[PDB]
Write a protein that binds this DNA or RNA. Structure first.
Lengths: 74, 165, 78, 113
RNA sequence: GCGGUCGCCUCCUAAAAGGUAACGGAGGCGCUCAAAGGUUCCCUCAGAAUGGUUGGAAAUCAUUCAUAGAGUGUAAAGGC
RNA sequence: UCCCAUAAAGUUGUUCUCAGUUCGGAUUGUAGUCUGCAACUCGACUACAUGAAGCUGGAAUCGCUAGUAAUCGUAGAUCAGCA
């Protein structure tokens, strides 16, 4: 490998509200929670994301202002 | 993860999405050219150098405009860093799906490109967002333009579930 | 505004409901800006202006909390 | 910093100092404190790890939107763009508000004196 | 007479070797460079549009059409 | 006398350690107390608080020897809204 460009950066550990789905490459530094073998046996402090809490993408939510409204006795 | 997520879903589709002759006419993902930009010739450009240390792997080269019409042209400023994905970083800040951390303009178009070189712009503050707006809350231009492994939009499209846009 | 009696006109909405026999649209002509409206408005103008004519107005799902010709031009900048 | 966008300042109390981010701020911020142990602390950079999680899961469960409803401005304008009001007779006619458009001073719509 | 020119370099006139005139038609020089010098490696042009805070039709790196139509410290031809 | 009774401050002063910053109630916003034969250009000030004008002042401006004014002040004559 030809070194002399990027600094120090590898994978990390992060668990979310749901499904704990953020474990890819990182450059994130913070203080370790408690380590595993399903994930990092090292400082686990990639913190928490929206990675699986709720997308807007394949999902639903609440609507816009309102309709005519002068149909339920006004 | 992601490098294997350039495998975890795709080896079977990219072995079937086409029905070519041998496994190798049936492609893989086309490489990327992670590039950033500026709208100032001095200080925003002189001080938009790390956001690559954040997103890309390149320390920071100093290429300038080439075509450079009436008032585009300047010299040597670090407005476009050549952080193209070669093989190691060829899993760069691109296939991070942090383009949902906006919830606007996910599906922008009916299609992507008539020139196979696709452009996927995190316009706004869409990308590099897992970092709080400390010094990244100022002027910042992007340039995510790279080709894909499909001649036109057609078969590129209904297997594009990777970046889902 | 208040609830309880939107002020549907007596004469005017009589003219409507008994001139709303068919699809034939004879809407207001009324040069009067005081009405109030039902869900059964069927395709037609109004005349919500009194210069020397009678002014076509919005027909489909227009302003919904109002009881007058909120959209009817009489003037602008100059 | 976390409730919506970012909100940086310190040394002050988080109860109503939300006024920056649209829709709501200070007044409602200190009047919507309807949660389990959320309150002004005068230490905006301390004492807070998971409390924000719940008192934010509310802000996402607070279906009354705030920033998300910044566009009810634009969309109630969208209904009115038939020269009615607040969009056509107040945005397409380039006039001021107060229904004294111009007898007193005016900077926000006419910024030029 | 007045005016303008007077040395050196490139092209056309100059009639497929060389040479060849006019107050004939065009441009330049009176340097610069410790690197822009020597050696060993390594790489590659334009006119082309993609849709990418931003867009000045032109701020970017790609991608492919790219046949020298590019780039050579300095004018022009011969060359690469 | 007897109702507007916190009438507003000088009475302890919760609250936001000088970034346009929990000072703002201007517009690009949601609009509203109740008495109208009808708020689109046909007043409001507003709370739901849109957080703007703003940090002492030019060729361009405001009380003054006692309770008058600094600040407001119970309200309303006038009159189906509002000094």
């Amino acid at each position: 490998m030809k070194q002399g460009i990027h600094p120090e950066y590898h994978q990390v550990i992060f668990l979310d509200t749901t499904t704990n789905f953020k474990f890819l490459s990182g450059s994130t530094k913070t203080s370790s929670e408690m380590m595993e073998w399903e994930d990092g046996k090292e400082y686990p402090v990639i913190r928490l994301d929206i990675s699986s809490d709720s997308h807007p993408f394949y999902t639903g939510r609440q609507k816009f202002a309102a309709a005519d409204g002068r149909v339920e006795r006004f | 993860r992601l490098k294997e997520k350039f495998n975890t879903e795709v080896t079977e589709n990219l072995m079937k999405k086409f029905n070519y002759s041998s496994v190798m006419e049936v492609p893989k993902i086309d490489k990327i050219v992670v590039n950033m930009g500026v709208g100032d010739a001095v200080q925003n450009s002189k001080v938009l150098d790390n956001a690559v240390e954040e997103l890309e792997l390149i320390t920071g080269q100093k290429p300038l405009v080439t075509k450079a019409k009436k008032s585009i042209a300047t010299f040597r400023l670090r407005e476009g860093m050549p952080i193209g994905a070669k093989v190691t970083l060829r899993g760069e800040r691109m296939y991070e799906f942090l383009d949902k951390l906006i919830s606007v303009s996910l599906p922008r178009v009916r299609d992507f490109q008539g020139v196979s070189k696709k452009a996927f712009d995190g316009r706004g503050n869409y990308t590099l967002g897992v970092k709080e707006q400390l010094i990244f809350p100022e002027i910042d231009y992007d340039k995510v333009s790279k080709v894909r492994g499909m001649d036109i939009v057609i078969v590129t499209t209904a297997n594009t579930d990777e970046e889902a846009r | 505004s208040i609830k309880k009696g939107p002020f549907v006109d007596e004469h005017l909405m009589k003219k409507v409901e008994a001139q709303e026999g068919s699809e034939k649209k004879q809407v207001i002509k009324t040069w009067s800006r005081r009405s109030t409206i039902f869900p059964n408005f069927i395709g037609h103008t109004f005349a919500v202006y009194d210069g020397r004519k009678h002014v076509p107005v919005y027909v489909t799902e227009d302003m919904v909390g109002h009881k007058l010709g909120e959209f009817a031009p009489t003037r602008t900048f100059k | 910093a976390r409730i919506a966008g970012v909100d940086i300042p310190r040394e002050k109390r988080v109860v109503i100092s939300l006024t920056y981010i649209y829709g709501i701020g200070t007044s409602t911020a200190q009047k919507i404190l309807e949660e389990a142990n959320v309150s002004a602390d005068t230490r905006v950079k301390d004492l807070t790890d998971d409390e924000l999680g719940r008192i934010r899961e509310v802000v996402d469960g607070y279906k009354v939107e705030g920033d998300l409803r910044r566009e009810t401005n634009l969309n109630i304008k969208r209904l009115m763009e038939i020269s009615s009001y607040r969009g056509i007779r107040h945005r397409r006619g380039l006039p001021v508000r107060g229904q004294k458009t111009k007898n007193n001073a005016r900077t926000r719509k006419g910024p030029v004196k």
